[PDB]
Each structure stands twice: as structure tokens, then as C-alpha cells.
Amino acid sequence: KTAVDSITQKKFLCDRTLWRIPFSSNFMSMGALTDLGQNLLYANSAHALD
Amino acid sequence: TDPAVRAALQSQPSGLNSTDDWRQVMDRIMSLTARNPDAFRQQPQANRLSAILEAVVPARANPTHEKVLAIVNALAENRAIRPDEAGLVYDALLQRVARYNSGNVQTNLDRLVGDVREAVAQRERAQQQGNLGSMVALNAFLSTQPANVPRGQEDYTNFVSALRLMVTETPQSEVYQSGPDYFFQTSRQGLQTVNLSQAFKNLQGLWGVRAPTGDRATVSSLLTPNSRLLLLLIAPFTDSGSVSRDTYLGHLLTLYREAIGQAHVDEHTFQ
Secondary structure (H helix, E strand, O other), X not given: OOOOOOOOOOOOOOOOOOOOOOOOOOOOOOOOOOHXXXXXXXXXXXXXXX | OOOOHHHHHHOOOOOOOOOOOHHHHHHHHHOOOOOOOOOHHHOOHXXXXXXXXXXXXXXOOOOHHHHHHHHHXXXXXXXXXXXXXXXXXXXXXXXXXXXXXXXXXXXXXXXHHHHHHHHHHHHHHHHOOOOHHHHHHHHHHHHHOOOOOOOOOHHHHHHHHHHHHHHHHOOOOXXXXXXXXXXXEOOOOOOOXXXXXXXXXXXXXXXXXXXXXXXXXXXXXXXXXXXXXXXXXXXXXXXXXXXXOOOHHXXXXXXXXXXXXXXXXXXXXXX
């Protein structure tokens, strides 16, 4: 009956793992050598990364 | 697998449909192959580019290992060394070449792989052709034996020619000399070894005088069993009329020839 006003907190735990962002067009593991990796190779082009 | 030391080698140092045969790859990459065209047009990019890059500028290769392995395998298949010795001698020859290499050495090596290929082929066909060594040994033995028989001569020389024909016509037969005698084995790792010298010594006295005495078994015990085997082995040879009939030797030869004959014939009939 005398429950107080409540405010919700949400958090999550993800241990023993590493966030992964594959360098592929549709993000899925279609092969060891990603398609975009193939596109960039043989281009002989240097790129900066931020 | 294959006896040709080039073939039995090249299975070991070679890819599968690489740019070693440039013409096939160049045919397949454009469109020329008819078995399954448009196969190359739809591979991933990397692969395609890489082949193309390989195709326009080929990459040189070092064929020393191939030739050395070819000659080593030729030695192995020709009983020059044991297979464990083959594994060792491959490295031995490789070091030998590597510490004395020159263009002349490579040229001699190609010459040598050709020579050993031919040598293996020749050895195989000669081993299946009649084994001249046995013929040489038999001729030496016959030179040791006298060529004159006081009682009868046509039967003796006819039999000698028959024996010569027998040893020539059946390869894998062995003629040699172990002690102070000559022998005749019908096969390597085979039974039926005939003491040729003893057989001829015993048979010398039965050539031209056993024709009238063939009807009575009074001298039949003079035939030692070794000579009996020797005669048995020449039944298929020395056909009728070669040895004068009505002779104890001739009678035995005819009986043995008739027996073996019914047999093989019935046998190929089988069923």
C-alpha cells in the first residue's frame, strides 16, 4: 500500500567478450577475407583513419 | 603408381592446374574453354585479379628439386638404393648440386633425367624380354660340355637346341653357376631346380643306344630323378619328331608332351 515513487535504472553486463565491427558490407561473416577487404586491395591507395 | 620416373616424380613436385601450363589457364580465363565457359567470369575479385596478374607476368620457378627428385626416384625404382636410402640420398644429391651449381650442371641434370627415364624403361622391358644373362650363362655351360656324342648325335644336338629355346622363350627363368656346376631354376623364388651339369653327365650315356632298349625296363634305373625332372621341364618344347622316336628318351618326351597337352587344353576350356 505504501510503496514509494519509483524511478527505473537499466544497465547490462557483457563480460569475457569483445565488441566486433566486421569490415564487410552487410556485417556478416561471409568469408575469412571480407568483400570490402577485397575491394580495397590491389587499389594501391593509402587511406587515413580516424 | 607409374613406372616412368618422370611421371612418378611429377606427381610429387607440382600444383594442380597452376600457371605451369600457361596456355590452359589463359584459355580458361578469357572464354575459350568450351567444357564450362563463364566459370572464371564469376569468381570473386581477388581471385580473379590474382590469376590475371599471374598470367600477364609469369613468375619464375626453380626446377632443381624436381630434376633431383626425378633422378632419385629413378634410382629407387631401379634397385640402386633402398627407399630409406632414397630419402637420404635425395638430400645428399641436393647438397652436392647446391655446392657446385652452374648452368652446365643444370644442363647435365636434364640430360641425366632423360637418361634415367630411358634406363628404367629399358630395364623393365629387358626383364620382361628374356634375361640375356641366363642365355650367356647357358652358352658358357654348353661350351664347357662336349659337343660330340659317340652313340648318336642328331638327338643330342636337337635336345641342346631345344634346351636353348626353352631358356630363351620363358623369361623369369634363371640359369647360373653356384658351385662347380650349372643349374636351372624355372623361376625366382621357385622350386624345380635342376642340376644341369649332373643331368648332362648322366644323360651322356643314354643318347644313341636307348632306342632299342626302350621296350625293356632293364636300364630304366640309369635315369637319375634329377634328369627326369630336366626332361619333364622340356616336354612342351622338343615337339614330335625333334627327338627320334622309339627311344627311351624319346618315349618319355612323347608321353610327357601328350600329358601336358591334354591338360592345358582342358584347362583353358574350364567351365
